[PDB]
Paper text:
Cell surface glycoproteins in the [name] Als family (Als1–Als7 and Als9) are most commonly associated with adhesion of the fungus to host cells, as well as more complex interactions such as invasion and biofilm formation, for which adhesion is a prerequisite (7–9). Als proteins are one of the most widely studied [name] virulence attributes; deletion of [name] produces the greatest reduction in adhesive function. The N-terminal domain of Als proteins (NT-Als)4 was implicated in adhesive function, prompting work to solve its structure. An invariant Lys (Lys-59) at the end of the PBC recognizes the carboxyl group at the C terminus of a peptide ligand, allowing the remaining peptide backbone to associate in parallel orientation with β-strand G2.
Specifically, Tyr-301 and Thr-116 side chains that flank Lys-59, positioning its side chain for interaction with ligands, were mutated to hydrophobic residues. NMR analysis showed that mutations in NT-[name]-pbc ([name], [name], [name]) shift the conformational equilibrium toward a monomeric, nonaggregated form of the protein that facilitates structural analysis. The crystallographic structure of NT-[name]-pbc revealed that the mutated residues in the PBC maintained the orientation of the wild-type side chains, but created a hollow, ligand-free cavity. Unexpectedly, the new interactions in this mutant protein also acted as a “zipper” that propagated the contacts of the flexible C terminus over the surface of the adhesin. Therefore, NT-[name]-pbc recreated the conformation observed in the NT-Als9-2·Fg-γ complex, even in the absence of exogenous ligand. Importantly, the mutated side chains were buried in the PBC, and as a result, NT-[name]-pbc retained surface properties of the wild-type protein. The NT-[name]-pbc structure revealed that the side chains of Ile-311 and Ile-313 in the AFR were exposed to the solvent and did not stabilize the interaction of the C-terminal β-strand with the NT-Als surface. We used structurally informed mutagenesis to remove essential contacts for ligand binding (NT-[name]-pbc) or to exclude ligand entry into the PBC (NT-[name]-gk), without affecting NT-[name] surface structure. Loss of adhesive function for the [name]-pbc protein shows that [name] binds free C termini of host proteins and excludes the idea that [name] interacts with ligands using surface-surface interactions. Structural analysis of purified loss-of-PBC-function mutant proteins showed that the mutations did not alter the overall structure or surface properties of NT-[name].
Numbering used by the authors: 0 to 312
Amino acid sequence: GKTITGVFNSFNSLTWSNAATYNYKGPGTPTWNAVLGWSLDGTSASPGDTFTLNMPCVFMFTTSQTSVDLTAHGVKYATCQFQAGEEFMTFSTLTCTVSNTLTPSIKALGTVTLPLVFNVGGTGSSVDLEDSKCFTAGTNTVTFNDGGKKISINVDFERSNVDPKGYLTDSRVIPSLNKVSTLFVAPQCANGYTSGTMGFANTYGDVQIDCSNIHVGITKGLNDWNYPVSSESFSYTKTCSSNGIFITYKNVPAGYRPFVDAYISATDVNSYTLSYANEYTCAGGYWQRAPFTLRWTGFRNSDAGSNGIVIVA
């Protein structure tokens, strides 16, 4: 029937719950539990009606579930659907629907908790690049929307403990494609890069590179969690197979960091290994060829649930 608004009306709590062993409290590190207040009124809301909650800068929900129910006392008065932004968009949403239990008489209240990770960058995609300027370390204000009607809360974010002068890698799962997105940023040559090679290959036949979905570029500095803030182009040659992706670059400018990121499929996405190529000759003669191998593991999923109170009137 109608498309109601203002159901989610309060941002009660936004608290971190380290999913795995991350050594900092960042928005890009799971899991952040958003507790939101909701209220449905039978007099003004009818079964079938629909409401969206729009959540900017939220990458995905760190749960295997595809929906969460608004449940006041073992009873379900609405079903909500998770729509992760991932790499498709900069925001995620909750598309909900009123259940047939919400009769004119019934008024349901309560809270819902939502395991969410933010997108503070991670690839050259327009999506991550915009979302890479969404938060900064320290005290931040996070705002969700319900159709013109906003709910906000303050939260403290910590920067990364990894020193941004060395080589930097990260990884992040994309469930809607069964793909893991990984990143590689060469060590910092403060005055620019003369030459260099950089990439990553699979190890022992479990990893494959999605050649179609690569990004290669240079970043003018980085954001607080060691992710690219912008992707320009520069002078490289590109070799890419389903086995592994490598570039040989030249003629870099001071203040810029070269990076390469790509979609992959590994057998067990919560345990895999990659081999990284690493030469760089700085603007300064410091030629050094330092390849390595890095193992990548899993996150600890959480649950979305709700509780509530009902008033039969």
